[PDB]
Amino acid sequence: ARKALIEKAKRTPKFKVRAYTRCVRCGRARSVYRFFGLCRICLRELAHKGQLPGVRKASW
């Protein structure tokens, strides 16, 4: 999650299968969700904050 790596993951890397996703909030490259583009930790924080529309605590 170095600044350099963050910036490097935003250029067309000469090949199709080199580009990978990073957390748009913290540059995490481990557990990003494609639907949101946020890592699990950032997802949880924003979900709790109520800043994610339509997302709530699941219970069944």
Binding site: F35, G37, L52, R56
Partner: protein
């Protein structure tokens, strides 16, 4: 321990989402990124005026930003100059003819974020933590607010070992859904590190 977010616990009922809009899977993440950028900019700029809440809604390629501020004059500025330049900045950020709105929070002692940021500001000014917390809880308790609670994290008064302070008064039932508990977080950056301030306020029931 490990209490969960008192707002996230009540997103369905007694509270509401800060962002209210719809987007399909194709164009969800982009709107969220724009939204986060807007929030960042607003927090950065309007901090002086005492921001407490930012609401974003979308109808059709439009943005209706509502800012809840203790002091609306600062935001508006003289002859509506500052509000206009802020609108210009936001519109330049994203070409979506944004429609900024300003509301004044009634009785600014009854908003938990305001209380939290005030306590953090006090801590930054090398105040006495315990006394400040007691006074803050007292002021919240004065103007209704059936329950009040303030927590300051640790590293008190440039000490070596961290410790929690916690002054509270009244009913703060974190276990009840129909509580209408207003919550606020703040971060106080001092020369000996960072401190966390949390404020809970309890405004009746149902």
């Amino acid at each position: 321990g490990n209490k969960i977010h008192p707002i996230g616990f009540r997103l369905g009922i007694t509270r509401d989402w800060e962002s209210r809009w719809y987007a399909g899977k194709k164009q969800y993440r982009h709107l969220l990124l724009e939204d986060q950028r807007i929030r960042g900019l607003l927090e950065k700029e309007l901090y002086s005026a005492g921001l407490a809440r930012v609401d974003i809604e979308r109808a059709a390629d439009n943005v209706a930003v509502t800012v809840h501020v203790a002091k609306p004059g600062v935001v508006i500025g003289r002859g509506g100059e500052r509000i206009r330049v802020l609108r210009e900045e936001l519109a330049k950020l994203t070409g979506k003819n944004v429609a900024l709105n300003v509301q004044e929070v009634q009785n600014p002692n009854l908003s938990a974020p305001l209380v939290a940021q005030r306590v953090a500001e006090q801590i930054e000014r090398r105040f006495a933590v315990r006394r400040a917390i007691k006074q803050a809880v007292q002021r919240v308790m004065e103007s209704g607010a059936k329950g009040a609670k303030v927590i300051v994290s640790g590293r008190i008064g440039g000490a070596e070992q961290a410790r929690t302070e916690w002054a509270a008064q009244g009913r703060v039932p974190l276990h009840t859904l129909r509580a209408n508990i207003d919550y606020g977080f703040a971060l106080a950056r001092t020369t000996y590190g960072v401190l966390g301030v949390k404020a809970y306020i309890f405004l009746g029931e149902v």
